[PDB]
Design a protein around this ligand. Structure first.
Ligand SMILES: N[C@@H](Cc1ccc(N(CCCl)CCCl)cc1)C(=O)O
Lengths: 52, 454
């Protein structure tokens, strides 16, 4: 079994960890936008089907 | 903290109707008609497999309100067959069944959503895999922020399917307004035709994996099944009737995506409508499959089967964040395997096997424990009819397609080793226990998550 709720309250509010969460919840959204721009680049940089 | 019961009667319908329909109806009919061989008998198996689905789900409406617990088809066998039989299912559901199903349906989202930028040739593989994964990442985030957000998303993409199938039925009736042959009747063939609908209807059990999150399950769970699954049945027979107004047997039995060709036949200026609707259909199927899977891995950890990181909840937002992050990572790790459509077929039958073991367990409980309260009960003939129908259909797999089975069955047996080391052993080396605890508290500190209080 893992850590207590009221034990976690002693650590989880430390500025180091709050800055860590702020950084990661920026980096995830940034990395998703990275894949989005990537996908759009693939869709531009690919040969379209010739018409019938 | 505790997970609040946010799923309404309507959201309970949108969880089920919004995940049954998915890709199935818009791509499967060719694979019914190949084994039916006739537009007469095809419209029979679409109704008959519907009837099998209603009686199955009606067994689950009982079973879920007898146990009254959120772990669905895992809980309902843990309460019966005990620790290791439930673990074998959970291991397979965690490692294979659910990551593969999410990933391929996310791929169906991508490949159909992009289709009008590539009308006559395959969409490029990198674009498909990126767009598939961007879907799984975005839906994971939506599920992490708010149960209210994810359930209000599930309405939108439940509606999207019913609107799309309404558009198919509308065009069908318009062609009837504007203006049984050939059947391969063999008793050893038509059972394989009935099997083809058990991709298309499959998913009616999903509402049981979220039982503890409905506002009043003793009403909502059986009522949402009875509202939903007959509506799906009606929609399917009308949708296939609509296809058979437009496409000949020779077109339908050869075509790649029957609904897209149907779309091209009528909607020449705006033919991309149906391709995009099959895409948006899938986006809601992934959401529901992801929401619902998160609860299984969470519940498994409460009952001692999985590491105690996954039982934790985020106090500020009241979502099982580690389970959703695990769901996502495990699904995205699945994306780069090659022969997926072999995998999900040779394990296709394992779902039906477990559904049968669950209703067998229900009758074994009605013998052993009349002590348990049962706010609704089904007449025992329906379970017995349903278990006959299930075990008959399991047997078909080993007649028509046994060849793959050893590759799947190896993974089932590979569940036993991990059970012993992970669950029965109780972590005797204190250095491994300290490593587990260290790993745990890092996740705790990082994600800001805490155990549930009952
Ligand atoms: N009707 C669905 C397709 C579907 C059906 C059944 C399963 N299951 C396992 C067999 Cl792949 C149930 C447990 Cl995940 C998964 C997906 C749609 O069209 O989205």
């Amino acid at each position: 079994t893992g850590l207590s709720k009221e034990e976690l309250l002693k650590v989880a509010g430390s500025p180091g960890w709050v800055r860590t969460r702020w950084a990661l919840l920026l980096l995830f959204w940034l990395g998703w936008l990275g894949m989005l721009a990537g996908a759009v680049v693939i869709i531009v940089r690919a040969p379209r089907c010739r018409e019938l | 903290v505790t997970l609040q019961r946010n799923i309404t009667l309507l959201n309970g319908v949108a969880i089920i109707v919004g995940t049954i329909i998915g890709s199935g109806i818009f791509v499967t009919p060719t694979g019914v008609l190949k084994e039916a061989g006739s537009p007469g008998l095809a419209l029979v198996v679409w109704a008959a497999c519907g009837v099998f689905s209603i009686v199955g789900a009606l067994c689950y409406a009982e079973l879920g309100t007898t146990i009254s617990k959120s772990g669905g088809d895992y809980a309902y066998m843990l309460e019966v067959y005990g620790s290791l039989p439930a673990f074998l299912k959970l291991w397979i559901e965690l490692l294979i069944i659910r990551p593969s199903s999410q990933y391929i349906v996310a791929l169906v989202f991508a490949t159909y959503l992009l289709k009008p930028l590539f009308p006559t040739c395959p969409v490029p593989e990198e674009a498909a895999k990126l767009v598939a994964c961007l879907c799984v990442l975005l839906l994971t985030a939506v599920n992490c922020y708010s149960v209210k957000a994810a359930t209000r998303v599930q309405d939108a993409f439940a509606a999207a399917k019913l609107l799309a199938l309404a558009l198919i039925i509308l065009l069908g009736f318009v062609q009837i307004g504007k203006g049984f042959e050939g059947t391969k009747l063999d008793v050893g063939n038509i059972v394989l035709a009935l099997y083809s609908g058990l991709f298309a209807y499959g998913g009616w059990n999903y509402l049981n994996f979220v039982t503890e999150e409905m506002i009043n399950p003793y009403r909502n769970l059986p009522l949402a099944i009875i509202i939903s699954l007959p509506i799906v049945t009606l929609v399917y027979v009308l949708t296939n009737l609509a296809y058979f107004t437009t496409l000949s047997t020779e077109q339908m039995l050869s075509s790649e995506a029957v609904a897209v060709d149907f779309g091209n036949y009528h909607l020449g200026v705006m033919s991309w409508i149906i391709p995009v609707f099959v895409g948006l259909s899938c986006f809601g199927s992934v959401n529901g499959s992801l929401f619902t899977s998160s609860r299984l891995f969470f519940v498994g950890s409460r009952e001692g089967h999985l590491p105690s990181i996954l039982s934790m909840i985020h106090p500020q937002l009241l979502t099982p964040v580690p389970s959703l992050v695990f769901t996502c990572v495990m699904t995205l790790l699945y994306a780069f395997s090659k022969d997926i459509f072999s995998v999900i077929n040779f394990f296709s039958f394992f779902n039906w096997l477990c559904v049968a073991l669950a209703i067998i367990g229900m009758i074994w409980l009605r013998h052993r424990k009349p002590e348990l309260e049962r706010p609704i009960k089904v007449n025992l003939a329906l379970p017995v009819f349903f278990i006959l129908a299930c075990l008959f259909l399991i047997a078909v797999s080993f007649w028509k397609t046994p060849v793959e089975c050893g590759i799947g069955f190896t993974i089932i047996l590979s569940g036993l080793p991990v059970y012993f080391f992970g669950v029965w052993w109780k972590n005797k080396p204190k250095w491994l226990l300290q490593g587990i605890f260290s790993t745990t508290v890092l996740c705790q500190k990082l994600m800001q998550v805490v155990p549930q209080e009952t």
